[PDB]
Amino acid sequence: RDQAGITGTWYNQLGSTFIVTAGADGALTGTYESAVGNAESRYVLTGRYDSAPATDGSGTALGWTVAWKNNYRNAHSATTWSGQYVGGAEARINTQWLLTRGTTEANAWKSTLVGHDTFTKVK
Amino acid sequence: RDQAGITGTWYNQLGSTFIVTAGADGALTGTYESAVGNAESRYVLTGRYDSAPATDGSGTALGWTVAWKNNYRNAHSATTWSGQYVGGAEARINTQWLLTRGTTEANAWKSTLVGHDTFTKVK
Amino acid sequence: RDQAGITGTWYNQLGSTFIVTAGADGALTGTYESAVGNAESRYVLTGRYDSAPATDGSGTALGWTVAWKNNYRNAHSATTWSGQYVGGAEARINTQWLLTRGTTEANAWKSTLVGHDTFTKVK
Amino acid sequence: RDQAGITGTWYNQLGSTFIVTAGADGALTGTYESAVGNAESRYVLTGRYDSAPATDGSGTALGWTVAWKNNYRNAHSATTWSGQYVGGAEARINTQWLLTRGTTEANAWKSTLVGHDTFTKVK
Numbered sequence: 104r105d106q107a108g109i110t111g112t113w114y115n116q117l118g119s120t121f122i123v124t125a126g127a128d129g130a131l132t133g134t135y136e137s138a139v140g141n142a143e144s145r146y147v148l149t150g151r152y153d154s155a156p157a158t159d160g161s162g163t164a165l166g167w168t169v170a171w172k173n174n175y176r177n178a179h180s181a182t183t184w185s186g187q188y189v190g191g192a193e194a195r196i197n198t199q200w201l202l203t204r205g206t207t208e209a210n211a212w213k214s215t216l217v218g219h220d221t222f223t224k225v226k
Numbered sequence: 227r228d229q230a231g232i233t234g235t236w237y238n239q240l241g242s243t244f245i246v247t248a249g250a251d252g253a254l255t256g257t258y259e260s261a262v263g264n265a266e267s268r269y270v271l272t273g274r275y276d277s278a279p280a281t282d283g284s285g286t287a288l289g290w291t292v293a294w295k296n297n298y299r300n301a302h303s304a305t306t307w308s309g310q311y312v313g314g315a316e317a318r319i320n321t322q323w324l325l326t327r328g329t330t331e332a333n334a335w336k337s338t339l340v341g342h343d344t345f346t347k348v349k
Numbered sequence: 350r351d352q353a354g355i356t357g358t359w360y361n362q363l364g365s366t367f368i369v370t371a372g373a374d375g376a377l378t379g380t381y382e383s384a385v386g387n388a389e390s391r392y393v394l395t396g397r398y399d400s401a402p403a404t405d406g407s408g409t410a411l412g413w414t415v416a417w418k419n420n421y422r423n424a425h426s427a428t429t430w431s432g433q434y435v436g437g438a439e440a441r442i443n444t445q446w447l448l449t450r451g452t453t454e455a456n457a458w459k460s461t462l463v464g465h466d467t468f469t470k471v472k
Numbered sequence: 473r474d475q476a477g478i479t480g481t482w483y484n485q486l487g488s489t490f491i492v493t494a495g496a497d498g499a500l501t502g503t504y505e506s507a508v509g510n511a512e513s514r515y516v517l518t519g520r521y522d523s524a525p526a527t528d529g530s531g532t533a534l535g536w537t538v539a540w541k542n543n544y545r546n547a548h549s550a551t552t553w554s555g556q557y558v559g560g561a562e563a564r565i566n567t568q569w570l571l572t573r574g575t576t577e578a579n580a581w582k583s584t585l586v587g588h589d590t591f592t593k594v595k
Contacts, residue, residue: 183306185324201308429552431570447554
C-alpha cells in the first residue's frame with residue numbers, strides 16, 4: 104500500500120539523510136548518513152515494514168538497522184529505528200531508536216542510548 | 227570475526243526462536259518465531275552487525291527488524307532488537323527491543339513497547 | 350540554579366498538565382493531569398533534579414514518577430519521565446518516559462510503553 | 473497491599489543497593505547506591521507505587537528517580553526506574569530505566585541511556 108509512500112529520501116530533525124526502498128515483500132534497503140555522532144558518509148541499512156497495513160487510518164509499522172561500519176569509520180555500534188510511516192499532506196516516519204555500542208561486561212550497563220527521530224520528505 | 231559466532235539458532239528467555247545468518251558484509255538474514263504476542267510460525271528478519279569488531283574484549287554490536295506479517299497473521303507492528311553478541315563459553319546476544327504498532331495520531335503516544343531479550347545457543 | 354526555572358505549570362504536546370515545585374534540596378513535588386490514556390483529574394508526582402547543574406550551557410537533568418492511582422481511577426501503572434530542563438527564551442523540559450503496567454509473568458514482556466514528551470511553559 | 477512487600481533493602485544484578493520505604497499514600501522514599509558509573513555513597517530517591525494493585529496476580533506498578541548529586545559527586549544526570557514489584561517466594565522488582573545526562577543542544581541526541589535492572593531481596 105505504502106511501498107511508493109516509503110520509498111525515497113527522508114531527513115530527520117538532526118539533518119541526517121535516510122535513503123530507502125520498500126520492497127513489495129516488506130523489505131527495506133538503503134543507506135543512512137548521520138549528521139551527528141562521528142559518522143561519515145553512507146552506511147548500509149536494512150529493515151522491514153508492514154506491506155499490508157490496516158485500512159483504518161493507522162500508520163504503517165516499520166523498522167531498520169544501521170551498523171556504524173563503512174569504508175571510512177567503525178563506531179563499533181548499531182542503531183535500530185522502530186516506528187510508523189504516516190501518509191498524507193505532510194508524510195512522516197515517527198521513530199524511537201536504540202543505539203547499542205560493543206562494550207565489556209563491566210560497561211554493558213551503559214551500552215545502549217535511546218532517542219526519537221522524526222523523518223520528513225523535506226529537510 | 228564473529229560471522230560463525232552469530233550464524234545459527236538462538237533462543238530467548240520466552241522460548242522464542244531466532245534463526246540468523248551473518249554475511250561477511252555485515253548482513254543479518256533469517257526468521258523469527260515468537261513464543262508470545264499472538265505471532266504464529268516464522269517471520270522474515272533482516273539486520274546488520276559490526277563485521278570488524280574491536281579486538282579489546284568488547285561485544286559485537288548488531289540489530290535486526292521483524293515486521294509481524296507473514297502468510298498466517300498481520301499484527302500491524304514491527305520489533306527492532308538492538309544489542310551485542312558476547313562470544314565465549316556461554317555465547318549470548320544481549321538485546322533491548324522497541325515494538326511499534328501502527329496507530330492513529332490519537333493513539334500514537336501508546337504506539338511503542340520496550341523490553342529486553344537475552345538469547346542463548348541452548349533453549 | 351534552575352529552582353525558579355523549573356517551578357511552575359508545564360504542558361506537553363498532548364495537552365497534558367505538569368505542575369511542579371523544585372526544592373532547594375533537588376526535590377520535585379506536584380501533580381500531573383494526562384490528556385490521554387483514561388486518566389482523570391490530578392495524580393501525585395515526585396521526582397528529583399540536579400540542584401547544582403554544570404555552568405557550561407548544559408541542560409539540567411531531572412526525572413519524576415506518577416503512579417496512575419488517584420481518588421477517581423487506578424490504571425495499575427506508573428510512568429517515569431527522565432529528561433533535562435533547557436532554560437532561555439523558550440524554556441523546555443525534553444523527556445523520554447517508561448510506563449510499566451502491573452502484569453502477570455505471562456504478559457510481563459508487554460508490560461512497558463516508551464515515548465517522549467516535550468514540555469513548554471505555554472500550551 | 474505491598475507496602476511491607478516493597479519496604480526494605482533491594483540489590484540489582486550490578487551489586488547496587490536500593491533502600492526504600494513505601495508510604496500508605498503511594499510514596500517511595502529512600503537512598504540508592506550504584507556499584508557502577510562513578511557514583512559514590514548514597515543518593516536520595518523518591519517515587520510512587522500503586523498502593524491498591526489488581527487482586528488478579530498482576531505485579532504492582534512503581535517507579536522512582538535518583539538525581540546523581542550528593543555531597544561527594546555530581547554526575548549532572550538522573551535515572552528513572554519504571555517497573556513492577558512481583559511478590560512471593562522470590563520477590564522481585566523488574567525495572568527498565570532511562571538515565572538522562574544534562575547536555576548542550578548539539579549533544580541532546582546522545583543524552584539518554586536505557587537499561588533494565590532486576591532487584592532481589594538477597595544480593
